[model samples]
Target: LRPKLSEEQQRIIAILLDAHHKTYDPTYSDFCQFRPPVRVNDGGGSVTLELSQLSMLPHLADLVSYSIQKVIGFAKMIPGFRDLTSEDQIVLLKSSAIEVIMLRSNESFTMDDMSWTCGNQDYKYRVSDVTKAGHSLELIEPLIKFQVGLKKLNLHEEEHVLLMAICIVSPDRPGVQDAALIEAIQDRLSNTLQTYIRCRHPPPGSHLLYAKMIQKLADLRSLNEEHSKQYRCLSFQPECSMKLTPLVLEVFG
Candidate 1:
């Protein structure tokens, strides 16, 4: 028999589900209207170029910035988040926003063609398009692999939202002043996730699924490190840095 959810657990899931739908349309409702297998190839060069010269770079940057804002909006709704010290809140957001963006993008990522349907038929982006933005295949390939692995898990929206919340509530993020409090929140979220998996997923493999999800978090840390390195290189150029939004520069720059 499936275990019953406590009132608190049900509330947590409801809050996360509502916030997720509010912040992002995971259904890609607009893109679905044009279901043809059309890929938008910008025909950009593989060689990394100055931000101004990389035709697709600005659009990618804008998309990241937009996602970051949505992440911040979503983070605020997570229970106990607003109670953190403002400094700690900023630290968590800055540290984990990129990872959450990466996880959230999995919804729009199509494994077969390895491209993202960015809100419209015209905005499809492939790894090659992103490579033009000063990132090499080294970062892009592993990132793609991570997306593929996560998609294969076939996570319920509940699991996905809980994972994103757990990512933000991390106590280990550098400069987190209130580690104990953050850890407590993380512990709560972790328990909620485990309980959810137990109730929703089948036996035997349910345990394995939880383990794999945790492993994915570990994978994200290394990917985030490589991404920061590439981002720093791009930001060093005044022409490039100027094109990025202030929020992106503040968080990732």
Candidate 2:
């Protein structure tokens, strides 16, 4: 377990969310992911510490750590992502929190990182890079290649997922290009994606995040090579460093 969150941090998170309710849309990765809306330079409004809240709880990470292919599919929701189920939401927060703690402790990923617990069990790999630089398409190549090799073997691998999620910590191109890179990576692995949740900055009702995540996955899953050919390489977030973060892909036999 990581250092327990002091009462102060947890309390602050509740206060922050109460103030930032307008910005609390689960649909937008910018609004929901790992600490995306912190004050940059004294600019202040409502700010939510959801990531911090999760950091306080490690038990939650355990639930979703099930086999990669076991991710839940919220079939009824459309346009924007629905708030995860109570249980899964807890799992996401904890699992993501554990990642953050390990992130701060390690200089970079060593094979040893596979030890982190999700749902109280060690997931084989959840080591995304320190920032987008590390998570770049370059970083994903080896994982994808390994999956290709698995297919060569006779045994099947079921729904083994690699979710490369990022919340552009900086409001700059460096933080955003990662999203673009992920878009390109999608070209190859899109076939295995059950879902890709990108929470971009958007006004309410615009649902830019939901629409894009859903549309991209739909387009990729489509057999229409013609449609895929039309899929643009760059997807951007407004007034933000491409909050286009969630990159979930799977491989199976």
Candidate 3:
């Protein structure tokens, strides 16, 4: 028989769920509603603005910045997270925020049309739309694949929230001072996730499901590396760099 969740594990799950719902807008439309419409060049066929000239880049950059803020708010609520030194908290967020954002984005990613719906039909974004912002397919393609694979898993909210918490509590992030402490917290979160899957997810495939989720974390590391590289390149161009928010620049720059 599957073991029942202990009081502490149950509490963790509740906290994660609460924090996730409080901070994330699943439709992602709120961020786009106040923004100006993306300006398309005037042409019947292929058009004229330079890569840096597309208004979508600035809008997407702002969206990313906003998402990162929500991530920080959510991270702060993860049990035992606030117990870490402030320096460590900053280090962890700085290192892993983008990965977390990418994971969270899965909620709004649509596989049917391969687009992200912001809030309304008017704000949907495809890879081609994002490519206009100067991100090559190198990062966008793998990112889409990761989202597709993760969505296919069809994880429960409890499992999804726990996975994100586990991703943040990782001890392997660079410059972590008390590795032992972080590892202990991560272990608890990991155990909670495993127990959850075994108890709630059907057998014969539960083990494989856990393994695949862990693999996604590894996939995130590579995606983050590519994202950082692309972000750095974007920051170099004076016009494009100016469009990014201070928070986005501070974290990724």
Candidate 4:
């Protein structure tokens, strides 16, 4: 584990932040060009996110739509910015996590074709990925009324954003043995429930962490199970198509 930084260490980071990239950076504008950087040096940007754009961030109903879209779009691979609304849902496939948000123009869509919105550049952007982080899944709904009074012409009322927080690096590891990882995870779930879950009310994090943690645990179990047979003592479910018997036999076979 890394040593926790003291005040002096933090000061160095603050100093670095103050000293780094102090230019207008003509190359990097804050808007996306086809969801991409305008020039190779420029970082592609999303549409401008304003205080008003954040209204949809905190809600449970939107999570499903957001997750499904996130899984789907990642399966498709999307870039940051695109040139026009006509190219909206071209399905760019991405596999990793980078705080994904999907935005749509507030247009009238009576059909599926219209709902996905691959037409009309004139419509406005409502909810998106960028603003999702600011809202608390547990709080903003009951505590605060959506902020009013922003741009007058762009009257986008019903906006929904998907707030997704993921552990991209799989930050920490479990020290339990190949056989013990499952038990460790199962206990984690149980303790979480007794202490945090089984409640209709949300907790410190969005409780979305619960879902990701469970999935990661399952994934770890699956992976470790594959390696179990290498030991002289245990047998495990054949993870691959061919149910190769012993690890050595499978390797030799």
Candidate 5:
């Protein structure tokens, strides 16, 4: 049980809860289901990476677009968040959108197979297979590792929402216009996260537990870089380029 929340914390939590519900729905397009026929098979019914830049990029791009849009909306929901300069807000969303989507991969994650289900497919697609199938292993593997590590944390739903908030407001993100204000917000979020964690879990109430969760953000940064590699590969495709929206291309492309 959480210690009683201070009034401001309660308001922030309410905003987060509403945004979390509206941001993603499991059965909808978010990781639970990939686009229909989200498969890459060569002639003669063989599985292949033949559609690497073609088929996969469109679907992947759509996912990123959806995530970025949802995150932009979510950021607006945070109290006082809109007061930040629009340019800074845009920069934050562009930088953190993929990482936010990565964190939301919870429902699609399957511990046993260590693979994510693609578009309602009966078979789970292993990250390793995606690599061989022409998807970049560099981008895919770290995603798997991060999800597994996050799962181990056993965080509350509120923690998940708060973590996403923290990511968006990060002071360290490049191009931030008001470093001082963003840094202040980030510090508040950090303390709020610590308080929520203590309330959510029982004793050890250990400092170590809180510190480890913060460490996950660094791991996410690495995954974001790998995701960029995938985007760069996709950006060059003629068809894929047309399909990707400007917002998507700039952030995740």
Candidate 6:
């Protein structure tokens, strides 16, 4: 981590933030380009037609892979990440991919619990309002609400970019193996984040803001844990044919 006094550090942070947003926000915008179409339904809150087909299963799998690879490609731009052991790199990406996906897609959620949006043609779903519409999943409720809480803070661009990197560099993930080594890298990256916050935010250094941001990261982790469980169950359902790619199986599987 570079000291706050170094102009180079600030410049590099700006460069990384620019590249980060350019790569991600546009794709996300593309994903939300469509609104849900009006549909005729029979009974249950669920779609009357089959939600999961062989086509749907592999398409979902590709989406996960795309999101994971996108996150890791951007995270690599952060200084010093390449220095970590290869095993640790995979572990960190595996553990945090779902959180990154949720964090990126958070804008789709509304304060109203009744609906949420996902991906390029405005898709929407309701909690199991009718017999078979969709089951009310435990994770989706808090995950949607959590975004509203996160949005309340209204982070500046630099802070938002830094927070994304921090979300991915977690050292506490189970099975990380080299706990001490991971923690050292996490500590430095954290310091870079804190120092950047203090430098850019001004007014008595805003320690409270930094603390809140860290708390939000913790919230993302808990949400990821639930999502992993949900995905694991889906992978096992024979009727669904929900196949997780190898990388996903390693991380969330």
Please tell me which predicted candidate would have the highest lDDT against the true structure.
3
RMSD of 5: 3.7
Q: What residue pairs clash in candidate 2, if any at all? A: 29-199, 61-95, 61-119, 62-119
lDDT of every model, 2 decimals: 0.83, 0.25, 0.84, 0.26, 0.70, 0.63
Measured on C-alpha atoms, candidate 2 has an lDDT of 0.25
- Candidate 3 versus the native: TM-score? 0.93
What tens-digit string does per-residue lDDT give for candidate 6 at 1-253? 4256366557657766875865675435443322223334434434324243222344345555667777888878766667788888888887788888777655455556545455433344443321122223477578657778777666776777777777777778866777777677667667766787776676553567889888989898788777766666565556543344666565565
RMSD for all candidates, in order, please.
4.0, 22.9, 2.4, 20.9, 3.7, 4.9
Write the residue-wise lDDT of candidate 5 on 1-253 in tens digits.
Answer: 4566677887787888898888766666455443432555444322234444344444555566766777788888876678889998888888888888787766567787787664556335565445433356567766778888888777777888888888888888978889899888877777777877776566563457777878988988988887677667655544666656677767754
User: Residue 115's C-alpha lDDT in candidate 2?
Assistant: 25
Quote model 2's TM-score.
0.18
Model 2: residues >4 Å from true position, as ranges? 1-70, 74-89, 92-138, 157-253
Off by over 4 Å in 3: 27-29, 37-50
- TM-score, predicted candidate 1 vs. hidden true structure: 0.89
Model 2: lDDT of residue 176: 34
For residues 86-118, what per-residue lDDT tens digits would candidate 2 score against the true structure? Answer: 433333333333222222112112333432222
lDDT of 5 at 72: 82
* 77-125: candidate 4 lDDT, tens digit per residue: 2121222122222221121221122211112222332222223432222
* Clash total of candidate 2: 4
All candidates in order of TM-score, best leading: 3, 1, 5, 6, 2, 4
- Candidate 3: residue 56 Cα off by (Å): 1.3
- Candidate that scores best on TM-score: 3
Q: How close to the true structure is residue 43 of candidate 3, measured as C-alpha lDDT?
A: 38
Model 1 gets an lDDT of 0.83
- Put the candidates in lDDT order, highest first: 3, 1, 5, 6, 4, 2
Tell me which of candidates 2 and 5 scores higher on TM-score.
5
Residue 108, candidate 4: alpha-carbon lDDT:
27
